[PDB]
Amino acid sequence: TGRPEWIWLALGTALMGLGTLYFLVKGMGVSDPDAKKFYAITTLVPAIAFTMYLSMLLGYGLTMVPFGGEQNPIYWARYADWLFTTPLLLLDLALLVDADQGTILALVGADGIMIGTGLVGALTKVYSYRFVWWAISTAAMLYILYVLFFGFSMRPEVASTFKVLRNVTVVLWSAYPVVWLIGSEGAGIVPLNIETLLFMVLDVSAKVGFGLILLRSRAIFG
Amino acid sequence: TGRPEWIWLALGTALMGLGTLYFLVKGMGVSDPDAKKFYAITTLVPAIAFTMYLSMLLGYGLTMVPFGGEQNPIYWARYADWLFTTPLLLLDLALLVDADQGTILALVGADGIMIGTGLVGALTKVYSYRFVWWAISTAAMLYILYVLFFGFSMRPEVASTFKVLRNVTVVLWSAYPVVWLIGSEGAGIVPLNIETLLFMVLDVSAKVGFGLILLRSRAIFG
Amino acid sequence: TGRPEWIWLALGTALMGLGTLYFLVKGMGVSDPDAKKFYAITTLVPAIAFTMYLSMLLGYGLTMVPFGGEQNPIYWARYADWLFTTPLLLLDLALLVDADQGTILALVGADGIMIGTGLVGALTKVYSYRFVWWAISTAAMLYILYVLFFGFSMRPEVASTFKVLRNVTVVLWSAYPVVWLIGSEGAGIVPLNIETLLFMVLDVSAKVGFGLILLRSRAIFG
Ligand SMILES: CC(C)CCC[C@@H](C)CCC[C@@H](C)CCC[C@@H](C)CCO[C@H]1OC[C@@H](O)[C@@H](O)[C@H]1O
Ligand SMILES: CC(C)CCC[C@@H](C)CCC[C@@H](C)CCC[C@@H](C)CCO[C@H]1OC[C@@H](O)[C@@H](O)[C@H]1O
Ligand SMILES: CC(C)CCC[C@@H](C)CCC[C@@H](C)CCC[C@@H](C)CCO[C@H]1OC[C@@H](O)[C@@H](O)[C@H]1O
Numbered sequence: 001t002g003r004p005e006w007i008w009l010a011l012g013t014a015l016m017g018l019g020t021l022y023f024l025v026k027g028m029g030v031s032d033p034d035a036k037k038f039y040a041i042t043t044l045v046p047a048i049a050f051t052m053y054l055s056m057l058l059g060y061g062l063t064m065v066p067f068g069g070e071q072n073p074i075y076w077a078r079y080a081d082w083l084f085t086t087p088l089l090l091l092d093l094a095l096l097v098d099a100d101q102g103t104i105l106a107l108v109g110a111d112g113i114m115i116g117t118g119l120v121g122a123l124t125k126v127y128s129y130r131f132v133w134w135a136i137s138t139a140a141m142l143y144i145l146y147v148l149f150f151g152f153s154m155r156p157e158v159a160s161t162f163k164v165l166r167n168v169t170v171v172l173w174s175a176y177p178v179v180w181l182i183g184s185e186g187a188g189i190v191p192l193n194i195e196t197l198l199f200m201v202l203d204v205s206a207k208v209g210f211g212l213i214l215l216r217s218r219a220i221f222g
Numbered sequence: 223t224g225r226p227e228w229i230w231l232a233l234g235t236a237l238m239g240l241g242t243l244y245f246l247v248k249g250m251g252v253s254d255p256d257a258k259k260f261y262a263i264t265t266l267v268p269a270i271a272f273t274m275y276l277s278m279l280l281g282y283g284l285t286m287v288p289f290g291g292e293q294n295p296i297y298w299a300r301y302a303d304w305l306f307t308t309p310l311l312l313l314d315l316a317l318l319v320d321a322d323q324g325t326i327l328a329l330v331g332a333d334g335i336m337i338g339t340g341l342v343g344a345l346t347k348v349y350s351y352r353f354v355w356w357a358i359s360t361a362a363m364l365y366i367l368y369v370l371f372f373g374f375s376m377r378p379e380v381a382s383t384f385k386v387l388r389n390v391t392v393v394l395w396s397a398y399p400v401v402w403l404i405g406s407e408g409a410g411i412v413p414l415n416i417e418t419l420l421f422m423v424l425d426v427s428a429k430v431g432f433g434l435i436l437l438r439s440r441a442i443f444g
Numbered sequence: 445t446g447r448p449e450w451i452w453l454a455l456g457t458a459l460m461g462l463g464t465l466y467f468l469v470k471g472m473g474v475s476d477p478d479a480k481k482f483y484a485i486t487t488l489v490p491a492i493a494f495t496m497y498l499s500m501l502l503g504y505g506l507t508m509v510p511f512g513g514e515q516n517p518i519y520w521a522r523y524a525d526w527l528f529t530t531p532l533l534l535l536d537l538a539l540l541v542d543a544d545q546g547t548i549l550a551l552v553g554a555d556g557i558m559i560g561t562g563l564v565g566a567l568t569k570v571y572s573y574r575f576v577w578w579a580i581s582t583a584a585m586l587y588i589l590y591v592l593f594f595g596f597s598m599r600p601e602v603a604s605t606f607k608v609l610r611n612v613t614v615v616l617w618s619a620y621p622v623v624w625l626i627g628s629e630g631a632g633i634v635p636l637n638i639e640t641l642l643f644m645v646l647d648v649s650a651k652v653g654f655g656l657i658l659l660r661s662r663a664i665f666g
């Protein structure tokens with residue numbers, strides 16, 4: 001509790017943990033191979049998130065980066081979380097609409113670039129350059145959003161759940177580059193405790209909130 | 223030869239190397255696509271292991287971690303080995319029984335969490351926390367063991383080889399958290415040379431020993 | 445522009461960037477699922493390369509390694525590029541000839557070992573050992589070349605484009621271990637600026653040059 005942001009990291013940890021356990025119990029019994037796929041993907045997401053929230057809470061996922069003539073606290077563990085979780089979440093949307101492998105690779109490759117360049121931006125020591133990396137990560141984000149709207153016989157429950165989950169994704173994901181820009185990785189207008197609060201609300205909605213909508217749907221069943 | 227554990231790292235290196243070459247020569251000629259799969263997976267495992275044993279032997283895969291008021295030698299390269307090899311080994315079991323993709327992802331995701339949290343525990347500088355990570359890695363291990371027994375028309379040679387390899391896995395894998403807890407990553411009761419000896423016997427049995435049983439079986443052929 | 449090699453890193457960055465945009469525009473409209481696969485793979489390659497060239501140009505992808513009694517500049521970001529791009533390129537060849545999954549895994553696993561051991565060699569602080577890692581990476585390279593010639597009903601356009609792209613691969617890839625050995629990672633005969641020039645010509649040919657030949661071919665269409 002030395003750092004003011006501990007509370008939001010604690011709550012993130014708890015909520016990802018409880019979400020994972022909920023999904024895990026909910027997907028017991030599931031015999032449908034397609035349903036198993038969606039549960040496996042959607043439960044793994046908050047499982048990984050739990051581990052990386054814990055790491056930040058305990059101090060392990062935090063590093064100091066010198067820039068602006070300061071030693072800046074950067075939580076590097078978010079990118080380790082997002083490196084795996086954001087593609088799994090895109091895979092959830094991809095499988096729902098029976099995407100072509102070529103489209104799956106494009107989403108996943110663009111997403112790896114999004115998070116990888118975002119990470120490089122987070123750890124870059126020349127201040128002006130950090131925003132060069134932010135711009136590149138955002139171009140990759142915009143690509144991903146474009147494919148979700150314009151890149152994809154489909155059952156009506158699948159169509160309907162996809163349109164909901166796609167709208168949840170556009171709104172929530174588009175917010176991340178904004179928090180990063182105004183927070184302590186970027187311009188440093190909003191302090192880290194508030195930034196951490198913003199990412200915890202964003203992540204819990206994008207993982208547990210997303211997963212509740214998906215796993216309650218008939219779309220996950222063949 | 224400055225460090226007493228060099229011998230076991232040398233022998234591990236030799237034995238993984240010779241195993242890889244044996245499997246490589248054994249899988250020449252193989253035309254059956256299913257058989258190719260099992261050889262590719264089972265030969266890659268000791269190939270990666272060879273590289274990471276060499277790295278520890280040469281000094282590259284070793285790092286000092288400060289905890290307990292000591293500078294502790296931690297061989298970080300084991301987790302780089304296991305990050306890739308333990309899933310490949312689970313993939314061997316998964317393909318043998320024609321597992322659903324949802325089950326394959328669950329095993330592989332749980333295994334990534336097992337090794338990733340194990341790594342974080344290995345490098346953590348607050349002593350009490352290291353065992354928080356050990357506990358979490360063990361929960362993920364227990365999950366994996368559960369799926370192998372309760373998560374899975376099957377040919378009798380496949381059934382029979384699976385039950386052998388599953389029993390080899392349960393016995394050998396369950397030993398790793400024990401060695402780690404009592405060794406120099408954990409409570410520091412057993413010294414590092416003996417710990418290194420325990421992991422070399424464990425790894426060689428779990429990779430080369432496992433691979434001998436699998437690759438001698440008729441189960442690998444469609 | 446403090447370091448003489450900046451020019452080649454700038455030009456590499458520009459050329460990978462323009463290549464990516466060219467491929468991206470060229471693969472708009474593509475409805476054929478097989479064609480989408482090849483574009484997704486072949487566009488992702490210079491996309492990742494662009495990011496890692498930029499990182500070297502900006503200073504981020506550079507590190508000092510002490511060996512020979514010097515502080516040696518090693519561009520570590522090449523291996524982060526190649527870790528993902530060389531397998532994707534092998535996947536391009538693999539899918540062209542309808543390779544068995546067992547062969548795909550062997551190529552990809554051998555390639556991961558090639559680049560991983562190459563990375564360990566690049567960062568190793570005992571000079572003589574660096575070349576132990578170089579030897580091991582080269583054995584893995586030779587394995588890969590062997591499979592491409594001896595490891596693989598096939599349409600004649602596919603046969604023909606494969607033989608072209610395979611010859612482009614053998615010639616270009618075999619050059620990398622040579623540049624590394626005589627450059628600043630190895631014996632230090634050729635200085636870093638010239639070495640950087642050699643890798644930029646090699647990478648642009650192997651990614652954009654390769655991709656031009658592949659994406660202009662009828663082989664990519666089912
Ligand atoms: C010991 C304490 C510190 C408690 C913390 C442990 C917990 C919060 C985090 C551990 C998560 C991880 C080890 C378990 C997640 C397993 C996922 C791979 C579950 C995927 O499950 C689906 O895939 C199989 C499908 O058939 C479907 O039924 C799902 O259950
Ligand atoms: C130069 C010395 C230092 C000797 C050390 C080299 C050696 C011990 C380690 C190198 C291992 C690696 C480069 C070769 C392993 C290749 C695997 C991918 C083999 C997979 O093989 C199967 O997959 C193809 C299948 O069709 C089946 O036939 C198998 O052979
Ligand atoms: C803002 C500036 C700094 C400009 C730099 C951005 C640019 C050079 C690098 C960004 C690359 C990345 C974000 C976009 C690459 C997307 C690939 C995944 C494209 C794969 O495209 C294929 O896959 C889908 C298929 O259907 C086929 O049509 C292809 O288009």
Ligand SMILES: *C/C=C(C)/C=C/C=C(C)/C=C/C1=C(C)CCCC1(C)C
Pocket residue numbers: 082085086089114115117118119121133134135137138139141173174176177180203206207
């Ligand atoms: C569960 C976590 C999720 C869904 C995280 C999503 C994160 C992003 C869409 C982040 C995007 C960013 C950019 C577009 C610019 C650079 C900074 C990032 C990584 C925050």
Ligand SMILES: *C/C=C(C)/C=C/C=C(C)/C=C/C1=C(C)CCCC1(C)C
Pocket residue numbers: 304307308311336337339340341343355356357359360361363395396398399402425428429
């Ligand atoms: C070839 C290597 C194998 C089969 C290694 C298996 C390793 C494990 C099952 C390790 C498990 C661990 C825990 C359950 C707790 C934390 C420490 C570990 C990683 C040793």
Ligand SMILES: *C/C=C(C)/C=C/C=C(C)/C=C/C1=C(C)CCCC1(C)C
Pocket residue numbers: 526529530533558559561562563565577578579581582583585617618620621624647650651
């Ligand atoms: C786009 C980049 C490509 C096609 C890079 C290919 C790189 C190699 C084939 C590198 C091979 C090396 C060895 C065989 C020995 C050790 C050093 C390396 C990694 C340069």
